[PDB]
């Protein structure tokens, strides 16, 4: 039944709040997913300023 919700393109929202060694940050992301092709396209923005860790370290979280 849940699979039925994924047969087309689905909008995605991502919202993260982080604290790494006391550096506080937030990231907002938007995009879409199409599970038929196992395909995801997203753009993330650090809304608090500069990201205090490297972007690649957050990919699996997002």
């Amino acid at each position: 039944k849940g699979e039925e919700l994924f047969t087309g393109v689905v909008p995605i929202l991502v919202e993260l709040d982080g604290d790494v060694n006391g550096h506080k940050f937030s990231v907002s992301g938007e995009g879409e997913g199409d599970a038929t092709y196992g395909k995801l396209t997203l753009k993330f923005i650090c809304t608090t300023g500069k990201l205090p860790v490297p972007w690649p370290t957050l990919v699996t979280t997002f």
Partner: protein
């Protein structure tokens, strides 16, 4: 990796897709990410539908990072290696676990290992699919928006289930 419900599960493996089976009510996804010789991230996320939109809401806590190791020292390249997510059922929690290793390229040609341990449990109480052992084959490409001056990341990812 935050929205594994968008993996392509081949038709012959569709009885193994936990992630979509928990929807729309969703699942909690928790991880411990251990950076070798450095700190760790602990994450808690809720992945569920809000109307017709799939939402990934996350809290991340990182501790015990070295002020000038590869992470806080920003020594990692802006790229990403393909990897497999190895999934196993957790029948006692009506959910799954996963284990995998991410290799982050360091700007000097070395590698920064990030060990990932993951657990997912459904938010709803309806039946879910508990899978046989298998993996998700993941490919990711990172880029920038030429018109964007804020700090950001553009991500293209493909995720395909396999191993059965």
């Amino acid at each position: 990796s935050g929205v594994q419900c968008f993996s392509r599960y081949p038709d012959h493996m569709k009885q193994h897709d936990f992630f979509k089976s928990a929807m729309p009510e969703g699942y909690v996804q928790e991880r411990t990410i251990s950076f070798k010789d450095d700190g760790n991230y602990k994450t808690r996320a809720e992945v569920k539908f809000e109307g017709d939109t799939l939402v990934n809401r996350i809290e991340l806590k990182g501790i015990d990072f070295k002020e000038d190791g590869n992470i806080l020292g920003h020594k990692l390249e802006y790229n990403y290696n393909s990897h497999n997510v190895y999934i196993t059922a957790d029948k006692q929690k009506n959910g799954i676990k996963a284990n995998f290793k991410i290799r982050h390229n360091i700007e000097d040609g070395s590698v920064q290992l990030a060990d990932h341990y993951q657990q997912n449990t459904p938010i709803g109480d309806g039946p879910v699919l508990l899978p046989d052992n298998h993996y998700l084959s993941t490919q990711s490409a990172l880029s920038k928006d030429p018109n964007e001056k804020r700090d950001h990341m553009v991500l293209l990812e493909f995720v395909t289930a396999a191993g059965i």
